[PDB]
Amino acid sequence: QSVLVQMREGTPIGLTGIYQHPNPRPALIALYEATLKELQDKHPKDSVYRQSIENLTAHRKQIVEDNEVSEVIENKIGAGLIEEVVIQAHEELELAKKMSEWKPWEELEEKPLEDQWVYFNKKGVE
Amino acid sequence: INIYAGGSAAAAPPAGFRIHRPATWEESEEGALSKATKYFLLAEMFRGLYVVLEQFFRAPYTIYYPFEKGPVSPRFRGEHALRRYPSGEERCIACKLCEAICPALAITIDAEERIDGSRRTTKYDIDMTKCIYCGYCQESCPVDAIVETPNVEYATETREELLYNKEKLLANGDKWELELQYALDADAPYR
Amino acid sequence: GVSQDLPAGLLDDIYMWATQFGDRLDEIEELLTDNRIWKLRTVNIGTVTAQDALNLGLSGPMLRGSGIPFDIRKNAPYDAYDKVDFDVPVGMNGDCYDRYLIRMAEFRQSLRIIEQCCNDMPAGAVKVEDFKINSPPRNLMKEDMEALIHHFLLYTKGYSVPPGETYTAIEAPKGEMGVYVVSDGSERPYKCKIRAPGFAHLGAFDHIARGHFLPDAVAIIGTMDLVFGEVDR
Amino acid sequence: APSWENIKDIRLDPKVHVDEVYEPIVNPADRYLQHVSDLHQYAKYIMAALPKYIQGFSVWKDELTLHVAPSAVIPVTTFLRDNTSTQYKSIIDITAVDYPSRENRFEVVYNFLSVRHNSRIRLKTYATEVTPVPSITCLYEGANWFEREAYDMYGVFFEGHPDLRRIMTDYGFEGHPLRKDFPLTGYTEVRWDEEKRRVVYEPLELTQAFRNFSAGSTAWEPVGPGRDDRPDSFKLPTPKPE
Amino acid sequence: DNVPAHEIVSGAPAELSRNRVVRIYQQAKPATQSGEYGTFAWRLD
Amino acid sequence: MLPGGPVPVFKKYTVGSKGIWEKLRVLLAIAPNRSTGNPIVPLYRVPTPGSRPEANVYQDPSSYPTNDIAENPYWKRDHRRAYPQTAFFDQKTVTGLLELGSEATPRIADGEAGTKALANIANGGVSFTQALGKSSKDVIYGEVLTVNGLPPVAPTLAPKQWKIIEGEAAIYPKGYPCRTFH
Amino acid sequence: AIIATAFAETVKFSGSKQELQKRTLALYRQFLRGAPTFADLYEVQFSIPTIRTKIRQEFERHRFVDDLSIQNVLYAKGHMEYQECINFWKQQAQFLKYFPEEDDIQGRHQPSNFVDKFLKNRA
Numbered sequence A: 001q002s003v004l005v006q007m008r009e010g011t012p013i014g015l016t017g018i019y020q021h022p023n024p025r026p027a028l029i030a031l032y033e034a035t036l037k038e039l040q041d042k043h044p045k046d047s048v049y050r051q052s053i054e055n056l057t058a059h060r061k062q063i064v065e066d067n068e069v070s071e072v073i074e075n076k077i078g079a080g081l082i083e084e085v086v087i088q089a090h091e092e093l094e095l096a097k098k099m100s101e102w103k104p105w106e107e108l109e110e111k112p113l114e115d116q117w118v119y120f121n122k123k124g125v126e
Numbered sequence B: 001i002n003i004y005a006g007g008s009a010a011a012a013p014p015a016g017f018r019i020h021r022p023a024t025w026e027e028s029e030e031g032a033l034s035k036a037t038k039y040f041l042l043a044e045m046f047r048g049l050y051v052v053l054e055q056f057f058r059a060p061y062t063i064y065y066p067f068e069k070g071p072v073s074p075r076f077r078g079e080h081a082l083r084r085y086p087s088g089e090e091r092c093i094a095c096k097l098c099e100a101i102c103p104a105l106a107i108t109i110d111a112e113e114r115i116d117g118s119r120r121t122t123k124y125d126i127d128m129t130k131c132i133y134c135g136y137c138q139e140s141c142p143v144d145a146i147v148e149t150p151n152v153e154y155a156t157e158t159r160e161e162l163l164y165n166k167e168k169l170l171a172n173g174d175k176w177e178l179e180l181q182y183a184l185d186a187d188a189p190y191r
Numbered sequence C: 001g002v003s004q005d006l007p008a009g010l011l012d013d014i015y016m017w018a019t020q021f022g023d024r025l026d027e028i029e030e031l032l033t034d035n036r037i038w039k040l041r042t043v044n045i046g047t048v049t050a051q052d053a054l055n056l057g058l059s060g061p062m063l064r065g066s067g068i069p070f071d072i073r074k075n076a077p078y079d080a081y082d083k084v085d086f087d088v089p090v091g092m093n094g095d096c097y098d099r100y101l102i103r104m105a106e107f108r109q110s111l112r113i114i115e116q117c118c119n120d121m122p123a124g125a126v127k128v129e130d131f132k133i134n135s136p137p138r139n140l141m142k143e144d145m146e147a148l149i150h151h152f153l154l155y156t157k158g159y160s161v162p163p164g165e166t167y168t169a170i171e172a173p174k175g176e177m178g179v180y181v182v183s184d185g186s187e188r189p190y191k192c193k194i195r196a197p198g199f200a201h202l203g204a205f206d207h208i209a210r211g212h213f214l215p216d217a218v219a220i221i222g223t224m225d226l227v228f229g230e231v232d233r
Numbered sequence D: 001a002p003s004w005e006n007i008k009d010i011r012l013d014p015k016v017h018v019d020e021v022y023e024p025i026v027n028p029a030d031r032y033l034q035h036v037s038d039l040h041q042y043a044k045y046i047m048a049a050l051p052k053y054i055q056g057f058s059v060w061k062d063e064l065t066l067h068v069a070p071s072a073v074i075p076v077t078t079f080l081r082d083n084t085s086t087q088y089k090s091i092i093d094i095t096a097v098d099y100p101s102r103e104n105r106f107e108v109v110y111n112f113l114s115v116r117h118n119s120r121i122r123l124k125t126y127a128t129e130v131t132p133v134p135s136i137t138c139l140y141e142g143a144n145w146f147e148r149e150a151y152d153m154y155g156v157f158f159e160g161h162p163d164l165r166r167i168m169t170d171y172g173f174e175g176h177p178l179r180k181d182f183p184l185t186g187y188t189e190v191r192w193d194e195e196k197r198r199v200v201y202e203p204l205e206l207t208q209a210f211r212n213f214s215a216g217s218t219a220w221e222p223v224g225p226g227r228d229d230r231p232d233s234f235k236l237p238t239p240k241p242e
Numbered sequence E: 001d002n003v004p005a006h007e008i009v010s011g012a013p014a015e016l017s018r019n020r021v022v023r024i025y026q027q028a029k030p031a032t033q034s035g036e037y038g039t040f041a042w043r044l045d
Numbered sequence F: 001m002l003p004g005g006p007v008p009v010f011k012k013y014t015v016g017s018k019g020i021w022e023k024l025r026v027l028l029a030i031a032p033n034r035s036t037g038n039p040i041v042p043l044y045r046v047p048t049p050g051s052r053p054e055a056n057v058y059q060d061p062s063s064y065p066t067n068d069i070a071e072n073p074y075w076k077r078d079h080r081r082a083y084p085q086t087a088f089f090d091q092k093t094v095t096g097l098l099e100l101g102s103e104a105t106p107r108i109a110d111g112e113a114g115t116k117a118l119a120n121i122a123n124g125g126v127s128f129t130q131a132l133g134k135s136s137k138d139v140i141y142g143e144v145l146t147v148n149g150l151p152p153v154a155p156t157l158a159p160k161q162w163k164i165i166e167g168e169a170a171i172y173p174k175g176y177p178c179r180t181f182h
Numbered sequence G: 001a002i003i004a005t006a007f008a009e010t011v012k013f014s015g016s017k018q019e020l021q022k023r024t025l026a027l028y029r030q031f032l033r034g035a036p037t038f039a040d041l042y043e044v045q046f047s048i049p050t051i052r053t054k055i056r057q058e059f060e061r062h063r064f065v066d067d068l069s070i071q072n073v074l075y076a077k078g079h080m081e082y083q084e085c086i087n088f089w090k091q092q093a094q095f096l097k098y099f100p101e102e103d104d105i106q107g108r109h110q111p112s113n114f115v116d117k118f119l120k121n122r123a
């Protein structure tokens, strides 16, 4: 299966490089489901990253399923026009697939030295 | 009223953000022969040329510099000068504030106790090749000694005529004192 | 704040120039705007997309020609741009012609702002009333002791800024200018990086010029109108 | 009938008269407290969301800073560029800073912007004269020139950079200027040698030496400790006395 | 030993390393004043 | 007309034409409104800046509560020494806010017991991931995320709701590829 | 995308001495092959062998450096200079900075023992 994120030709909306997306809502729904899939599968349940993106995708998907008008969906999803929302969806999904390989939920890999992060505030150095 | 997911009511797009559409050759409320005539007789071109011509008949802005100078203000900052009191004594006391605040470090001073027991200078230099003409030196002096004249006509053929010393500044202040008094009488209250 | 107050009889002359400036801007628009050759040299040239203009750090008219309404004067007002009306033009197509139209629109909106400020210049001081930061008047420095002390210190050692650091920015006409200052509790800065919009503009010049002929390269550098003393920092 | 010869002389028009000017006394930082509590919550979310990388975060007057390590630059930048709540797409600046007192003297600083949400954010790492930093040209193409600058100015090496070379300094310059060990005037100067007929580089000799005037620095502490503006939701609780 | 020689990558001359001496110190408490802020920092000149 | 023109010639402060030449100019002008641009000598820059009467009456301007001589202590209007501290929060100081709470929402034991509880976190006694997993729903959904469960967004200090102006108020007409935002 | 210039190498810090050995040798080879170009592009008043001698001297300068990171830094700086020279970015002065020796003998007294330095106050 494949999805159309961005038409680089066709009717121009007010942004350059971005053009009108035919049939956005199905693409948004498929991408949101794929993000939820990658998170439900590869990420721990108790990670804040997962819960945040899950509630975000679920709420945006509900706003996309209940509504039909794109202007309304834009006034509800407060993130640009719908053709920018699809790109936010794509970028979020690719971030999920990348973060499945990295392990942000894990504990700190490099612990800073005590000398690092001291800025002219210790009252006894100048 | 509304709950937002990674968004806001500000970042929600403007109501009319979606531009309508590009018009085509159809839906053109200007007949083909009209825009053809404007295409072949170069209308806007002739209009621009006429706007050019009207300037041909208008008053030129030019002034003849050596016989008519441009506007000059009391706040203007040109050549330097060291002033005197009406008594004939010099105002400098070697507080060396002009030497400290000067961004370019052009100034160079050396004082000592004068024979009459007073504080005065034996050396006061300015490298006008280091000067940026900022006026911080006429601002720091608490006696209004050093000033900046409206003079700008002091070009030279050599770079060593620009290393002004104390004598060259005291004479410059003896010369321009009347002009300095005008500028000071109309600049001091704001300064 | 400001060094010295306005001299008398300045708002009047500003109002005179302002009443006459719209005409001269219009005389410029007559030659340039609707002309064919100007369009041929500026229509579909230097065309840059929204996402590219953001990835490249571009700001100002280069960004407002892609369709993004960003103006720091509205999204983060600093001096009095929140207490005075004005509009921000925006354009599609990202070309040079749209940037030229934006620049002319900014001329006229700035004229609107000048008229408003001349109509409402409040009385009071033009500089902070804390003589530990701003030098006092001279009629006090020559009569009050604490004022002369403060004058001396500000014009020898200067004023001690608190430790910290900040990037603060503005809507400079070129773009989004900025300064990254660092402090160490002294009168001398520890670091000061000037972020220069012409820098990122010239850096994008390679992405922007690829595919275009030399006359178009000239027009591109002209859209950005880089001031190379800025570009070189 | 009317003309410029009969135009109103505004110079005589009556002008506003104000007896007493009233300017209330106000702190400029009380304006920021709610935004500051918000930034604290947002930083807390990000630290909970990427515990592997974020060492800490500071806040100061509507400015956020995230402290990380050189390994964590590409991942955190991906999060800050692609995540929905943090669409920090624009790269405003890159800057290095020299703190010789540290083991890792350098401190690279990324500034970021979100035109979407209208917000900025920072991101700090650390480096040395030999330990490089990952390059974010993979994401933000505008970082190319800024990283070339930081290299030429301070000597920091941005790994992965397609063409890292000097941009400001002279083509044969040997040194990194903004280091605190580098003298103001540099080590070299140029003159025209009539013999060789060439601009030639010679050791420095100045006709007026540099006078620092930083020896007049104040002996008294000028600005005492500030004032806490941490929101109480981020203050470590005091246990009840008993 | 194993203290890195950054002198090789500094781009600076070698005369600083071979002929020139530094001194590390704290500024003495001035007798003309009673303040002590200019101290507590280890200057290198 | 609009609040931004057009305006006639007899209100513009420029040197124009007089007599039959004005009739001819208004005939032969693309826009007779327009001016030559040369300023009117009697008015512009008169009296000269070095002869303004207003400089003798001038006095250094001030504001009332700062020029007040009696109840105007400096330590109340010292805004520099009241500067807000640069707060710093490492993972230690954040896990304590998680395992424990804050002065607004305490969850801490009283007495030296809770003191050493803080001490266990001041040192590496409990970690950030451990107390992220030991955090009940009311903790996360209410102190890390929102009550609704959604993450917070990049805050704006001074939000800007944009608006579009179209048609007659706009700087340019409809045909041109530029628009106007308020 | 902002593409790399002609002879640009991506900065890549090798983890071993055995690979950097090879990279340094390729750099030396390129300098030698390109030396005649360094003689044509810059109006040079001496030999191609003398350029190759100076190149060998500059590589013998850091022959005895065993810290790997410093070697990576040195190699990157050298590739920078090769890119600066082979593309005609440097002008004559910045290049003949590396050839002080070829220029005429600067005067007569060049002190090498103590007493002369003392008479010239250089000791």
Ligand code: SF4
Residues within 6 Å of the ligand: B098, B101, B102, B103, B104, B105, B106, B107, B126, B130, B131, B132, B133, B134, B135, B136, B137, B138
């Ligand atoms: S005004 Fe000129 S002389 Fe005075 S401090 Fe500034 S640069 Fe120096």
Ligand code: SF4
Residues within 6 Å of the ligand: B091, B092, B093, B094, B095, B096, B097, B098, B099, B109, B140, B141, B142, B143, B144, B145, B146
């Ligand atoms: S500030 Fe004035 S009085 Fe003081 S040294 Fe300078 S010129 Fe002399």
